[PDB]
């Protein structure tokens, strides 16, 4: 359902080259916040920035 | 030019792998030291005129080999690589080292058809 979450993020944004920079600038904050010993192999920081941005979009 | 842009390495058999810029640089200094030698010992003017003509042809072959006169060669009968012949051609610095580069973290293989799969998914060995 990650590809269904990315099409909702690219829509209703008016610039597809600008909302992909906010995903890349949020994935670096999720990587620095996950510097502890707990590391989830299924939820990458690049994928977690797309799910967290689509939940706050509504 | 700096010497790393005209590299001189040695092969496994003992022979040296020189560049064509070193043979064109040596033709300028050998004809410039001869012109300073002829102007010191008061040479005949038919020899000083012929020495300055070869100094004019040595720099012009160094800049653009084969532009005005005949193309100079070396040991092999191919054309020597001048300063201008490394940027204008298809194998020059623009079309082979700046617009297109060889990248790291790369590879290739043959492709087979994968059914029972999805889109955005590829088989990787």
């Amino acid at each position: 359902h990650i590809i269904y979450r990315s099409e909702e993020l690219l829509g209703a944004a008016s610039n597809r080259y600008n909302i992909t920079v906010r995903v890349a600038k949020r994935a670096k904050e999720n990587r620095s916040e996950d510097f502890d010993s707990i590391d989830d192999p299924n939820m990458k920081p690049a994928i977690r920035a797309i799910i967290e941005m689509s939940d706050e979009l509504t | 030019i700096p010497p790393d842009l005209r590299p001189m390495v040695q092969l496994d058999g003992g022979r040296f792998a020189t560049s064509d810029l070193n043979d064109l640089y040596r033709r300028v200094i050998n004809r410039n030291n001869r012109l300073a030698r002829l102007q010191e010992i008061l040479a005949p003017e038919i020899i000083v005129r012929n020495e300055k003509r070869m100094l004019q042809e040595a720099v012009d072959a160094l800049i653009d080999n084969g532009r005005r006169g005949r193309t100079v060669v070396g040991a092999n009968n191919r054309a020597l690589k001048s300063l201008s012949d490394i940027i204008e051609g298809k194998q020059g610095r623009f079309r082979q080292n700046l617009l297109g580069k060889r990248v790291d973290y790369s590879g290739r293989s043959v492709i087979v058809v994968g059914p029972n799969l999805k889109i955005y998914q590829c088989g990787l060995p």
Binding site: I3, S6, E7 | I119, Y120
Partner: protein, 43 residues
């Protein structure tokens, strides 16, 4: 939903892919082409 009661050619399949793009987007359109090739490879 509509009922396609005719024989399906290649040009009639491209009208179905273009209709799924205009209504649903790109994610559901790729799933329709992913399921239409399971149906073609089986029969």
């Amino acid at each position: 939903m509509t009922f396609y009661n005719y024989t399906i050619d290649k040009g009639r399949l491209k009208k179905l892919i273009a209709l799924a793009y205009r209504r649903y987007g790109s994610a559901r359109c790729s799933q329709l082409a992913d399921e239409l090739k399971e149906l073609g490879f089986r029969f």
